[PDB]
């Protein structure tokens, strides 16, 4: 968010059984808050980020699926199979992040555990961890945001470079790839 | 539910702050000294006491969680007060930092032993004393995390 240091917390709203029933009915009456949403399909659990009034995540996780809302299942707004992107209209009550304009290379990744990991940009869609971590830690964090020192969105977490069970580098989808998915079509 | 990283501590005399980094509650020697912390099971002895670096440490209490030390080397620091206000600070050395907006001395009083965070929210150091000229503070003085990390390897 706007200025100050990036700090985060996590709140669980549903259990395994509660998730399964609302996945099949597609009806979710629960109240929504925050910028980042912890998503699930029962079988797999990951992350979703709100940038520009739209809730984005990875295609390798959600596919061509619908999101559960208070009015029933909501169809996707954007689907970009090649850039590994998916988008639905941001749920009522969620806050959106503004794309980065400062061009900084000191990125900060937010995990599902609500921890903030320091990342250094090493390319257009590549960055390296300042402290190498085990692969288990990064699991469930796909679709999560990479923030700049101001707390603005640089990109969404896609894949980790794993050698022996430890990850030294991360792979992401940059914010400019989102805006060209908005300007494209199908 | 809900654990704090920063504790608001008090002696018979003054009142200051205490920050949990790596399973241990740290604060300034000029506030606690060789004192013990209160717990429902009795007084707890200090795990570390470094009189030279103005450091004191006891094991982390109940209702607390630890801050992870900074690994990004950023110079854009942020001070957290006893009132929970965040002050932007620029690093001007190993243990020195300047305020972007010069505040009166009262504003910083009792915020010693508090943390100085980097943009990731990770601990860079502990607020020790404020640099005062005429009653207005323009800069701050701190104990960096690498002093805490060596005092542990001992």
């Amino acid at each position: 968010q706007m200025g100050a240091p990036i700090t985060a917390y996590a709140q669980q709203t549903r259990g395994l059984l509660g998730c399964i029933i609302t996945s099949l009915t597609g009806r979710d009456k629960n109240q929504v808050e925050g910028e980042v949403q912890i998503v699930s399909t029962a079988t797999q659990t990951f992350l979703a980020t709100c940038i520009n009034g739209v809730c984005w995540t990875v295609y390798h996780g959600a596919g061509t699926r619908t999101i559960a809302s208070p009015k029933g299942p909501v169809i996707q707004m954007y689907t970009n199979v090649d850039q590994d992107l998916v988008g639905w209209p941001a749920p009522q009550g969620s806050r959106s992040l503004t794309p980065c304009t400062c061009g900084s290379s000191d990125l900060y990744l937010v995990t599902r555990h609500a921890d903030v990991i320091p990342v250094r940009r090493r390319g257009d869609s590549r960055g390296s961890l300042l402290s190498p971590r085990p692969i288990s830690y990064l699991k469930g964090s796909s679709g999560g945001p990479l923030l700049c020192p101001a707390g603005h969105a640089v990109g969404l977490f896609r894949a980790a470079v794993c050698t022996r069970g430890v990850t030294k580098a991360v792979d992401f989808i940059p914010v400019e790839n989102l805006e060209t998915t908005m300007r494209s079509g199908s | 539910q809900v654990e704090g990283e920063v504790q608001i501590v008090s002696t018979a005399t003054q009142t200051f702050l205490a920050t949990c980094i790596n399973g241990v509650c740290w604060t300034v020697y000029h506030g606690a000294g060789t004192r013990t912390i209160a717990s429902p099971k009795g007084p707890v002895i200090q795990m570390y006491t470094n009189v030279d670096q103005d450091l004191v440490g006891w094991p982390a209490p109940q209702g607390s969680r630890s801050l992870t030390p900074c690994t990004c080397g950023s110079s854009d620091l942020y001070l957290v007060t006893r009132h929970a206000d965040v002050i932007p600070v620029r690093r001007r050395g190993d243990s020195r930092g300047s305020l972007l907006s010069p505040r009166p001395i009262s504003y910083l009083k009792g915020s010693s032993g508090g943390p100085l965070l980097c943009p990731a929210g990770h601990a860079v150091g502990l607020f020790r004393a404020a640099v005062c000229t005429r009653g207005v503070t323009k800069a701050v003085d701190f104990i960096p995390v690498e002093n805490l990390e060596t005092t542990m390897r001992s």
Binding site: Q1, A4, I6, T7, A8, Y9, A10, Q11, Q12, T13, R14, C19, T22, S23, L24, G26, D28, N30, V32, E33, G34, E35, V36, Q37, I38, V39, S40, T41, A42, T45, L47, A48, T57, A62, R65, T66, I67, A68, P73, P91, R95, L97, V110, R112, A114, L147, G151 | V2, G4, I8, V80, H83, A84, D85, V86
Partner: peptide, 22 residues
């Protein structure tokens, strides 16, 4: 086949605060 469901949230906007109650 089934829908994607929201099982939790993460808020970035939380500013430092004093924990309420005694």
């Amino acid at each position: 086949k089934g829908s994607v469901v929201i099982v939790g949230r993460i808020v970035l906007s939380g500013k430092p605060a004093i924990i309420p109650k005694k």
